[PDB]
Amino acid sequence: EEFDCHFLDEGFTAKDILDQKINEVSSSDDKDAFYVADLGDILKKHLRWLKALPRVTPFYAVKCNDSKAIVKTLAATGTGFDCASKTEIQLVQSLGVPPERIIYANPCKQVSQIKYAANNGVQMMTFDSEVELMKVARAHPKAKLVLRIATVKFGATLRTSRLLLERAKELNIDVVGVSFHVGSGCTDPETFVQAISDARCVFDMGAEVGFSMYLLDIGGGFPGSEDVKLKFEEITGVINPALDKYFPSDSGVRIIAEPGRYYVASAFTLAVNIIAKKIVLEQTFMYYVNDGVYGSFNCILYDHAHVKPLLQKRPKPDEKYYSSSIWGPTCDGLDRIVERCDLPEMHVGDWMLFENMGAYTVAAASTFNGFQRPTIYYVMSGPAWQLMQQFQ
Amino acid sequence: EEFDCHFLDEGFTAKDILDQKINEVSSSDDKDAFYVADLGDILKKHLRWLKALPRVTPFYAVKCNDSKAIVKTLAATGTGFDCASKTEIQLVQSLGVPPERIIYANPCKQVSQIKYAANNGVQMMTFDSEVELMKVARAHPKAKLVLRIATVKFGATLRTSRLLLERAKELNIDVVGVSFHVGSGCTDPETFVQAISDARCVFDMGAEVGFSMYLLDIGGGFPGSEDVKLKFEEITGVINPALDKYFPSDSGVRIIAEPGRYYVASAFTLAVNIIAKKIVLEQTFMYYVNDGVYGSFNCILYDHAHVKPLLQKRPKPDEKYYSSSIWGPTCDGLDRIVERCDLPEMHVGDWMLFENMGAYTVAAASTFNGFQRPTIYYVMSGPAWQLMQQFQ
């Protein structure tokens, strides 16, 4: 290891360790925000993934949570990986994942990075512009391209798709298939069905001009926590049919997905410390915690997260709540975590909990104002590690 | 040095080095975005600050551009520094800046960082909440407090200020003075006058209860480029009066300010490379460059910047422009730099320039999606270095 990985004893859960670690610090000082990353919770998710989409190989979107522990755990399990930069590819390879288990999914790759990928055995890439294709002919002509269709920054339409395939023929580049991305703000499950239906169409378009296409990549956008309206399995209910319909297994197709938030969202809890307080007329409170929209909560901007503040201190049986807002630690007037919420009067020194903080949080945090990335404590149960061995 | 500092030869300017460096990398590519930081431009600014506000000592807001070369250059000049975290204080001190030249301006400090500041000789801090005071009593009782007033996350109103001074008396904490912060979205110069007027009032309020206050801190929010409507000196036109009126120098007051964007905004140009391109019906273009809203351009979100794309390639004498948008390099659909603009048809390999990119750009950049922080080339002219000596 080059990471703080600890084994949970018999009856201990992740949240118990969190509860423990905040307690075993209350002497002295230094009540810096920290994560508890339950690697078990990631296994659970992989396993559950195998159950739900048993046709669909998952290729973890590294971008989502780039942490070495997450990728090493996942690697051990036998997931594929979705990399979008040379540096993502290097990470994965430096954990001994072979290239066959990587898809360079970024549709607009800087040429030197295409070059990097080519000098390292990464054959499968994604595209959706004619220019992209010209790049690939120059930099990686043996590459296996996946055409990325629309469902906006990325996604070729069907008219372009026809023109791309032709332009890819005159170029002698192999198009092994089609990829779409639904997006996390996915309300309708129908969207999947529609997109699979369009992909089946491009597969047909593609055979018409002699492409022997064998790959369907269904993107990501699967939820990572139970605390959403449209649940994971509900989505897989309308996919398996649509897949069996347009992509029956006797057609020798191979189906993959790019899940990110799905694996890691719930796996991480964030304990931040109330470090200052203001009373406004004792009617409403403003609390200042030591992580902001420039740190872990950057997601309330970039990823459109809604965060729910949880009390680490088990609440009293009826206690009088007040209108409270939570703020980040920076000199930025706009660094505000919760605009309005309902809370017991709390105190400087009290810790707040933030559940489901794995996805698109630490990965896009910057140390603006000089504030440090919170320290991450990896934990894994006895059972969990057994299960990670079976996958080896 | 631990930074790439180069001396411009006779007729070379910063922009000439940029023009030079992009030309010296046209063969075997690797066209990564890079900054050209003219440290001479920084000097110019300090010199011009001395002329404009000759009463006011400038305390650079480290937060804004924490680069080691920027700090060291400024330190060498004799500016003070505005730190908001332990880590900002450390940086400054690690460059030999004595603590008398530091103001811990963050009004809501985490107790351990107060403690750090206290064990390191940093006596001047800022506050605006009764809880803040309680903290200071416990952690740094000898501290010199600056009360930060309102002009919202920070700023005690005049009612609060009366109550704070009282509560600071019963606590035996010294309040040496007042600070306000106008903000960069400052349209009216009047706001300064108003705020100085309020600060004069708090000085009076404070003497009423026997505070011997000697410090006025006027914040920052001064513009860093000529390319704004309300210009630097114009603002100093309405300040020098206001100051001489409410804070005449025979009153032995000491006046400081916390400029950030003022010193550095214009000093940095960013060269990004167009790495992909799409054509939509050849009518409108989408260009993809290799820096985004997760990197340098994070400011278009956090700092509310509007960026003007410049052609590195001197334009043809009439050339046909098209509606173009510029995008960052991440898989984030929302990663968009310019939503719409007017540009010659340009190519994968062409570089675009972004002027005035010093402030609140690199300092809040994260390496999301695995994309690297652009490399920074520091440069300083013969003249410039001469002038940095005089200040020593």
Side-chain angles (χ1 to χ4, degrees), chain A residues 127-171:
Chain A
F127 76 109
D128 75 359
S129 51
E130 73 140 41
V131 174
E132 199 64 3
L133 271 151
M134 281 151 218
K135 274 148 80 200
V136 171
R138 200 163 92 252
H140 196 9
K142 255 61 280 295
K144 289 330 196 186
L145 293 194
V146 188
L147 193 179
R148 164 147 183 206
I149 70 184
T151 65
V152 64
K153 183 179 197 171
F154 304 129
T157 49
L158 288 182
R159 303 113 287 241
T160 334
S161 292
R162 181 78 205 183
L163 309 187
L164 286 172
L165 290 165
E166 251 142 18
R167 188 84 187 94
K169 193 73 169 191
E170 53 205 46
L171 288 187

XYZ file of all heavy atoms in Angstrom, chain A residues 127-171:
358
model
N -14.711 8.525 -30.590
C -14.659 9.715 -31.440
C -16.064 10.161 -31.779
O -17.035 9.434 -31.533
C -13.869 9.426 -32.716
C -14.617 8.612 -33.724
C -15.072 9.196 -34.894
C -14.870 7.254 -33.515
C -15.777 8.453 -35.816
C -15.573 6.510 -34.451
C -16.027 7.114 -35.594
N -16.176 11.360 -32.341
C -17.443 11.844 -32.874
C -17.259 13.070 -33.785
O -18.216 13.784 -34.080
C -18.428 12.128 -31.735
C -18.094 13.418 -30.962
O -17.093 14.096 -31.294
O -18.845 13.773 -30.033
N -16.032 13.325 -34.219
C -15.795 14.314 -35.277
C -14.952 13.779 -36.440
O -14.133 12.869 -36.270
C -15.167 15.585 -34.709
O -14.035 15.287 -33.914
N -15.150 14.345 -37.623
C -14.312 13.972 -38.748
C -12.852 14.321 -38.449
O -11.964 13.509 -38.709
C -14.804 14.569 -40.073
C -14.577 16.073 -40.246
C -14.139 16.459 -41.663
O -14.695 15.891 -42.635
O -13.230 17.321 -41.804
N -12.614 15.495 -37.865
C -11.269 15.896 -37.429
C -10.622 14.854 -36.496
O -9.463 14.477 -36.661
C -11.304 17.276 -36.732
C -9.964 17.631 -36.146
C -11.735 18.338 -37.704
N -11.398 14.384 -35.526
C -10.953 13.341 -34.631
C -10.394 12.210 -35.416
O -9.298 11.745 -35.111
C -12.078 12.805 -33.774
C -11.552 12.080 -32.575
C -10.779 12.977 -31.610
O -10.687 14.218 -31.826
O -10.265 12.433 -30.618
N -11.144 11.772 -36.426
C -10.708 10.684 -37.298
C -9.384 10.977 -37.986
O -8.509 10.106 -38.046
C -11.766 10.378 -38.339
C -12.786 9.356 -37.913
C -14.002 9.705 -38.642
C -12.333 8.004 -38.302
N -9.235 12.198 -38.497
C -7.992 12.554 -39.139
C -6.864 12.436 -38.131
O -5.864 11.832 -38.433
C -8.059 13.905 -39.840
C -8.771 13.825 -41.208
S -9.609 15.394 -41.670
C -11.128 14.852 -42.483
N -7.047 12.927 -36.915
C -6.044 12.748 -35.860
C -5.622 11.306 -35.684
O -4.452 11.011 -35.543
C -6.603 13.235 -34.541
C -6.415 14.705 -34.329
C -7.537 15.313 -33.512
C -7.368 15.075 -32.052
N -8.650 15.256 -31.405
N -6.605 10.417 -35.684
C -6.404 9.000 -35.388
C -5.676 8.280 -36.495
O -4.878 7.408 -36.215
C -7.742 8.271 -35.082
C -7.542 6.766 -35.000
C -8.371 8.804 -33.797
N -5.964 8.640 -37.741
C -5.235 8.128 -38.884
C -3.742 8.469 -38.746
O -2.888 7.607 -38.881
C -5.797 8.705 -40.133
N -3.442 9.732 -38.449
C -2.088 10.191 -38.218
C -1.436 9.516 -36.994
O -0.310 9.042 -37.060
C -2.048 11.736 -38.117
C -0.645 12.355 -38.348
C -0.655 13.858 -38.661
N -0.509 14.668 -37.448
C -1.480 15.395 -36.876
N -2.712 15.459 -37.404
N -1.215 16.083 -35.765
N -2.134 9.449 -35.876
C -1.445 9.138 -34.626
C -1.608 7.706 -34.100
O -0.804 7.258 -33.273
C -1.832 10.132 -33.567
N -2.629 6.989 -34.583
C -2.983 5.683 -34.019
C -3.823 4.893 -35.007
O -4.945 4.529 -34.707
C -3.734 5.890 -32.681
C -3.832 4.665 -31.816
N -3.158 3.491 -32.086
C -4.512 4.451 -30.667
C -3.435 2.601 -31.152
N -4.253 3.158 -30.278
N -3.276 4.619 -36.195
C -4.105 4.085 -37.287
C -4.651 2.666 -37.054
O -5.631 2.291 -37.698
C -3.162 4.104 -38.477
C -1.793 4.035 -37.878
C -1.866 4.771 -36.589
N -4.034 1.898 -36.143
C -4.465 0.535 -35.812
C -5.554 0.475 -34.737
O -6.071 -0.588 -34.427
C -3.250 -0.287 -35.392
C -2.756 -1.286 -36.451
C -2.295 -0.663 -37.811
C -3.467 -0.301 -38.783
N -4.301 -1.434 -39.313
N -5.902 1.635 -34.190
C -6.921 1.804 -33.147
C -8.302 1.267 -33.484
O -8.700 1.211 -34.644
C -7.037 3.270 -32.789
N -9.035 0.901 -32.444
C -10.366 0.352 -32.585
C -11.352 1.395 -32.149
O -11.557 1.568 -30.972
C -10.520 -0.887 -31.684
C -9.743 -2.147 -32.110
C -9.580 -2.175 -33.620
C -9.180 -3.509 -34.181
N -8.928 -3.279 -35.627
N -11.977 2.093 -33.080
C -12.796 3.234 -32.684
C -14.220 2.906 -32.296
O -14.887 2.118 -32.926
C -12.773 4.335 -33.740
C -11.461 5.086 -34.004
C -11.747 6.307 -34.804
C -10.726 5.484 -32.748
N -14.680 3.528 -31.233
C -16.075 3.488 -30.880
C -16.698 4.837 -31.219
O -16.209 5.878 -30.796
C -16.248 3.189 -29.414
C -17.683 2.953 -29.121
C -15.452 1.987 -29.036
N -17.755 4.830 -32.010
C -18.396 6.075 -32.405
C -19.366 6.460 -31.317
O -20.188 5.657 -30.914
C -19.151 5.866 -33.711
C -19.704 7.002 -34.581
C -20.359 6.373 -35.814
C -20.708 7.931 -33.875
N -19.278 7.689 -30.841
C -20.137 8.149 -29.752
C -21.343 8.944 -30.239
O -21.206 10.045 -30.745
C -19.311 8.970 -28.763
C -20.138 9.796 -27.835
C -19.500 9.929 -26.502
N -20.360 10.677 -25.606
C -19.910 11.380 -24.580
N -18.605 11.445 -24.321
N -20.770 12.027 -23.819
N -22.534 8.392 -30.066
C -23.744 9.019 -30.619
C -24.452 9.963 -29.634
O -24.206 9.904 -28.428
C -24.742 7.973 -31.167
C -25.375 7.177 -30.028
C -24.052 7.061 -32.154
C -26.299 6.041 -30.485
N -25.329 10.827 -30.148
C -26.072 11.770 -29.309
C -27.279 11.127 -28.646
O -27.756 10.084 -29.075
C -26.493 12.988 -30.106
N -27.741 11.764 -27.571
C -28.921 11.342 -26.815
C -29.698 12.569 -26.329
O -30.899 12.500 -26.032
C -28.546 10.513 -25.575
O -27.820 11.339 -24.664
C -27.691 9.307 -25.941
N -24.890 20.719 -27.191
C -24.280 19.689 -26.362
C -22.866 19.407 -26.873
O -22.650 19.337 -28.079
C -25.158 18.392 -26.304
C -25.285 17.725 -27.687
C -24.650 17.396 -25.229
N -21.922 19.248 -25.940
C -20.489 19.074 -26.210
C -20.084 17.795 -26.983
O -19.218 17.857 -27.862
C -19.724 19.163 -24.885
C -18.222 19.065 -24.988
C -17.575 19.196 -23.633
C -16.081 19.509 -23.756
N -15.439 19.856 -22.450
N -20.669 16.645 -26.643
C -20.344 15.394 -27.332
C -21.587 14.674 -27.840
O -22.672 14.817 -27.264
C -19.560 14.423 -26.427
C -18.291 14.991 -25.838
C -18.055 14.897 -24.478
C -17.317 15.586 -26.640
C -16.884 15.410 -23.919
C -16.147 16.100 -26.085
C -15.931 16.007 -24.727
N -21.408 13.884 -28.905
C -22.453 13.013 -29.457
C -22.790 13.268 -30.915
O -23.480 14.229 -31.241
N -22.313 12.412 -31.810
C -22.678 12.548 -33.217
C -24.133 12.132 -33.411
O -24.575 11.130 -32.839
C -21.750 11.715 -34.111
N -24.869 12.905 -34.208
C -26.228 12.535 -34.591
C -26.203 11.415 -35.623
O -25.144 10.996 -36.060
C -27.030 13.727 -35.116
O -26.265 14.438 -36.089
C -27.402 14.643 -33.975
N -27.367 10.913 -36.001
C -27.403 9.841 -36.960
C -26.921 10.278 -38.371
O -26.265 9.495 -39.075
C -28.784 9.190 -36.972
C -29.192 8.320 -35.771
C -30.578 7.728 -35.977
C -28.192 7.210 -35.498
N -27.219 11.520 -38.769
C -26.736 12.042 -40.057
C -25.219 12.117 -40.064
O -24.582 11.733 -41.037
C -27.310 13.425 -40.419
C -28.842 13.539 -40.478
C -29.404 14.437 -39.359
N -29.345 13.790 -38.044
C -30.401 13.523 -37.282
N -31.629 13.857 -37.682
N -30.231 12.930 -36.104
N -24.637 12.613 -38.981
C -23.182 12.651 -38.881
C -22.645 11.224 -38.846
O -21.657 10.921 -39.486
C -22.669 13.455 -37.653
O -23.635 14.432 -37.272
C -21.389 14.180 -38.000
N -23.329 10.349 -38.120
C -22.871 8.993 -37.948
C -22.693 8.311 -39.287
O -21.685 7.618 -39.497
C -23.820 8.219 -37.064
O -23.744 8.734 -35.763
N -23.652 8.527 -40.194
C -23.559 8.017 -41.570
C -22.317 8.572 -42.269
O -21.560 7.823 -42.877
C -24.827 8.351 -42.379
C -24.825 7.835 -43.848
C -25.132 6.322 -43.944
N -24.597 5.684 -45.157
C -24.789 4.402 -45.485
N -25.509 3.614 -44.692
N -24.266 3.907 -46.607
N -22.116 9.885 -42.158
C -20.972 10.574 -42.769
C -19.628 10.195 -42.121
O -18.596 10.103 -42.799
C -21.161 12.104 -42.760
C -22.447 12.785 -43.280
C -22.281 14.282 -43.300
C -22.892 12.323 -44.657
N -19.633 9.958 -40.811
C -18.412 9.547 -40.122
C -17.943 8.173 -40.569
O -16.763 7.985 -40.864
C -18.585 9.606 -38.616
C -18.589 11.055 -38.144
C -18.959 11.171 -36.660
C -17.253 11.740 -38.472
N -18.874 7.229 -40.647
C -18.544 5.879 -41.038
C -17.922 5.833 -42.429
O -16.939 5.127 -42.655
C -19.777 4.996 -40.950
C -20.192 4.753 -39.502
C -21.584 4.207 -39.434
C -19.227 3.823 -38.775
N -18.490 6.600 -43.349
C -17.969 6.689 -44.693
C -16.571 7.304 -44.705
O -15.629 6.777 -45.338
C -18.936 7.479 -45.569
C -19.632 6.581 -46.571
C -21.081 6.937 -46.799
O -21.499 8.080 -46.464
O -21.798 6.052 -47.316
N -16.436 8.412 -43.977
C -15.153 9.083 -43.848
C -14.105 8.202 -43.135
O -12.907 8.360 -43.335
C -15.338 10.421 -43.147
C -14.095 11.281 -43.144
C -13.918 12.088 -44.418
N -12.621 12.759 -44.381
C -11.514 12.262 -44.919
N -11.539 11.103 -45.555
N -10.380 12.931 -44.833
N -14.581 7.262 -42.332
C -13.726 6.341 -41.627
C -13.344 5.178 -42.511
O -12.416 4.443 -42.208
C -14.421 5.849 -40.385
N -14.070 5.009 -43.608
C -13.784 3.933 -44.561
C -12.693 4.367 -45.498
O -11.720 3.650 -45.686
C -15.028 3.556 -45.369
C -14.922 2.253 -46.163
C -14.987 1.030 -45.242
C -15.151 -0.242 -46.040
N -15.469 -1.375 -45.129
N -12.862 5.552 -46.083
C -11.862 6.100 -46.997
C -10.512 6.279 -46.287
O -9.452 6.320 -46.937
C -12.350 7.383 -47.700
C -12.875 8.485 -46.781
C -13.887 9.462 -47.451
O -14.824 9.009 -48.155
O -13.763 10.698 -47.254
N -10.563 6.325 -44.951
C -9.377 6.461 -44.092
C -8.780 5.145 -43.636
O -7.664 5.114 -43.131
C -9.702 7.300 -42.868
C -9.872 8.763 -43.191
C -10.025 9.556 -41.938
C -8.689 9.234 -43.970
